[PDB]
């Protein structure tokens, strides 16, 4: 759709709302709107104000120290996308020092063309994390949102789910909700930027986010590339020229704009390549009549002079004003205190320069990796020498790998002196290569370059080391490498052995145990045998060579690569969790965890067993006297050192199993079981230590029960001896026989028959029995418990 309203350039509002009326008919702003100095401002001062006309912002938006405001949807609810043509310190949107502000309400905004957003010190705002920036921002890493209401409190949110879309943030779904009243609209993944309509019918290729009629450039709410007569256009057809990357303008417009600056104080534009360009690059000059700047017949560079020749570069907006520059009449200092890389925009705005009148200085910059972005810098005259008669200065630079690809980059410096200090990851090789490429080798006095600070954590040995001998063993490993010798032997002071366990192959360079090795005499392979290595374990090894400072010389030493070595296998640890539980009179379930330290992959498990036997004393102890509770179940060193001074049990192999059940086991009898785990079986079997364990099957119910009939014999003295066989197949054994003999119509007598009484006396004999019928029941009490009582033996004496 077309934009009914004026261009409405970007302005600023301060100290009262009087200036607000300028927004009367602003469908879109052609610039940046800055909002601040709202002191005598109240929530009531705002509720009657809103500018739904505004749609899009070319440059950026500024909010700072505004009082009483609580939400912006109540003002500008039709705000859609930010071009970010003019960034404000690498940021297209800043909301800073807001009081009373609680939610934004900018649910009508879909994407941002360019830039980032920083939110801070706005201690009353909610609904912050409730928004997916990835839809909103084509990049989210550069956002800065801290020190506000949400991050110091836990203010409630009302996701309008009673439905709103939810997406994964890290691993969980969150309703991307703008407010209680609104939530983050999500078009299908097909509409990457053009968006869709409410029902999902996706918009036109000229749309951006919102559109009334799906698939209609004339109904694109946001013109993705350009605007022309209510029809978003990928290009501006002739004679209309591309204007500010967003609209098409005829020749009359551009000429009128140029005239306006001509007769005024400025940006008198020109025409070049179908664009109403303010200022065309080097090599062009705009003619007399027409407003195009033709390639001149001479070297006319686009010279960018400097205000007082001194300028810092600290963010994008510090540099975008240098776009298209080639010649700088001044000196330059670089200081970006970020933490995130900015080389992308850096190469875009910069690099097109070739020569600097003044000096170049690097200071305090942190995330910078290399100075490759200076694409065309070849000659610097450095007229205005840096204080101390310097043309280059590097100081507190934390991430500088290189400066330029000296294979292909060509550089020339006229005068001055360099400066390098506290550059922990930039080694002297680069400096020497540059100063020899620069042609200023004999210009730097002492202390102009700090040796210890610069590139200490860097490592540019640029020389490989070879292991003249290799050997592994049980826990010790012997290596020997070639004696590496610089022409100046004195630089070498020793060799540093770095080793560390290597779980995998993904191993980094430069935990990490270090060992020192003495320099060899000047065969002479320094080498080393290392000790105390756990068996069957990968390790990573490399060495470094120590040299002196080597400032007049360039002895940069050497190094060795990462070697992945594992130690050998050996006898494993003890098998773990060996238990002994019976599930049957002949089945006992056996369990065991594998050893804690297999010390080499386990081949199998070794287990043995055997059966115990009862105590002999159990056959000769009275089982009815009190106490019957039966359980229920170097000179060579000294001499040589002085002399020489330098100049079958049943078992089976348990393989890949931790559970065993054994059959054919005697009911209610203990068994002695040992166990091992084996990490080497066929080649002279290597196993763990024996794991003794004991189990006794549960008693059976029949063995305690008495077998065979019971016989009585009567003597003439009315003395009775009772005959019965003991249950020769008991649960382990039987300790005693309980004989219960009564009289017919009389009381009952209970008798004790222990094992010795039975065997020695052929049972038991009853003396002093008057004639009468007798009921005699016998119970053989075993290791288990009570047997079955025998049937009564009826007889008369």
């Amino acid at each position: 759709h077309l934009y009914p309203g004026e261009v409405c350039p970007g302005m600023d509002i301060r100290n009262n709302l009087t200036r607000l009326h300028e927004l009367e008919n602003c469908s879109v702003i052609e610039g940046h709107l800055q909002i601040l100095l709202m002191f005598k401002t109240r929530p009531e001062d705002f509720r009657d104000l809103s500018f739904p006309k505004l749609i899009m912002i070319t440059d950026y938006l500024l909010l700072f120290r505004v009082y009483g405001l609580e939400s912006l949807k109540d003002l500008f609810p039709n705000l859609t996308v930010i071009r970010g043509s003019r960034l404000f310190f690498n940021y297209a949107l800043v909301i800073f020092e807001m009081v009373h502000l609680k939610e934004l309400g900018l649910y009508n905004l879909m994407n941002i063309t360019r830039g980032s957003v920083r939110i801070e010190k706005n201690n009353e705002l909610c609904y912050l994390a409730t928004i997916d920036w990835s839809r909103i921002l084509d990049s989210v890493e550069d956002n800065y949102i801290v020190l506000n209401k949400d991050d110091n409190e836990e203010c409630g949110d009302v996701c309008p789910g009673t439905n709103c879309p939810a997406t994964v943030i890290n691993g969980q779904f969150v309703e991307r909700c703008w407010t209680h009243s609104h939530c983050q609209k999500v078009c299908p993944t097909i509409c990457k930027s053009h968006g869709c309509t409410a029902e999902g019918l996706c918009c036109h290729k000229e749309c951006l986010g919102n559109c009334s009629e799906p698939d209609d450039p004339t109904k694109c709410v946001a013109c993705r590339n350009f605007y022309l007569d209510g029809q978003c256009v990928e290009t501006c057809p002739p004679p209309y020229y591309h204007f500010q990357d967003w609209r098409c303008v005829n020749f009359s417009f551009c000429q009128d704009l140029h005239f306006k600056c001509r007769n005024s104080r400025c940006h008198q534009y020109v025409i070049h390549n179908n664009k109403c360009i303010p200022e065309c690059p080097s090599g062009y000059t705009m003619n007399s009549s027409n407003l195009m700047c033709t390639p001149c017949l001479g070297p006319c560079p686009k010279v960018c002079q400097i205000l007082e020749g001194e300028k810092t570069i600290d963010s994008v907006t510090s540099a975008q004003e240098l776009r298209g520059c080639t010649v700088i009449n001044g000196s330059l200092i670089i200081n970006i205190r970020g933490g995130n890389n900015l080389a992308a925009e850096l190469e875009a705005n910069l690099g097109l320069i070739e020569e600097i009148s003044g000096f170049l200085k690097i200071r305090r910059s942190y995330a910078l990796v290399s100075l490759s972005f200076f694409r065309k810098l070849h000659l610097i005259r450095g007229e205005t020498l840096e204080i101390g008669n310097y043309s280059f200065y590097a100081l507190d630079n934390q991430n500088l790998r290189q400066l330029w690809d000296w294979s292909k980059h060509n550089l020339t410096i006229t005068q001055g002196k360099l400066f390098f200090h506290y550059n922990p990851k930039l080694c002297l090789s680069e400096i020497h290569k540059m100063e020899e490429v620069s042609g200023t080798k004999g210009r730097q006095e002492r202390n102009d370059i700090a040796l210890k600070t610069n590139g200490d954590q860097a490592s540019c040995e640029n020389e490989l080391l070879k292991f003249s001998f290799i050997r592994t063993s049980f826990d010790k490993i012997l290596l020997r490498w070639e004696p590496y010798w610089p022409p100046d032997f004195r630089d070498l002071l020793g060799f540093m052995l770095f080793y560390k366990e290597a779980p995998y192959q993904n191993v980094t360079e430069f935990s990490w145990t270090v060992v020192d090795i003495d320099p060899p005499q000047r065969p002479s392979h320094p080498g080393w045998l290392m000790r105390g290595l756990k068996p069957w374990t990968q390790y990573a090894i490399f060495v470094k060579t120590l040299v002196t400072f080597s400032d007049e010389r360039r002895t940069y030493g050497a190094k060795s690569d990462i070697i992945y070595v594992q130690t050998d296998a050996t006898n494993p640890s003890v098998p773990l969790d060996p238990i002994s539980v019976s599930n049957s009179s002949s089945q006992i379930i056996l369990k065991w965890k594998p050893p804690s330290d297999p010390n080499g992959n386990i081949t199998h498990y070794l287990v043995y067993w055997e059966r115990q036997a009862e105590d002999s004393e159990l056959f000769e102890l009275d089982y009815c006297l009190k106490g019957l509770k039966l359980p229920s179940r170097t000179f060579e060193d000294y001499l040589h050192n002085v002399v020489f001074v330098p100049r079958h049990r049943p078992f089976e192999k348990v393989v890949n199993k931790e559970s065993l059940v054994i059959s054919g086991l005697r009911h209610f009898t203990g068994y002695r079981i040992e166990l091992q785990a084996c990490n080497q079986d066929s080649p002279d079997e290597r196993c763990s230590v024996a794991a003794y364990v004991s189990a006794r099957t549960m008693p059976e119910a029949k063995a305690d029960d008495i077998v065979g009939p019971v016989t009585h014999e009567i003597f003439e003295n009315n003395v009775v001896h009772l005959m019965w066989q003991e249950p020769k197949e008991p649960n382990g054994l039987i300790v005693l026989y309980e004989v219960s003999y009564r009289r017919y119509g009389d009381e009952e007598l209970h008798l004790c028959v222990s094992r010795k009484h039975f065997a020695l006396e052929r049972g038991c004999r009853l003396r002093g029995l008057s004639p009468g019928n007798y009921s005699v029941r016998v119970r053989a009490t075993s290791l288990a418990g009570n047997g079955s009582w025998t049937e009564p033996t009826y007889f008369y004496v």
Binding site: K476, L478, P523, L529, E636, D637, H640, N641, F644, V645, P646, R647
Partner: peptide, 21 residues
């Protein structure tokens, strides 16, 4: 000294030659 350098650990020919005049 030499005993542990030679049998507790291994000593090569360089040790042997260093352990004489």
């Amino acid at each position: 000294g030499i005993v542990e350098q030679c049998c507790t650990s291994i000593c090569s020919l360089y040790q042997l030659e260093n352990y004489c005049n």
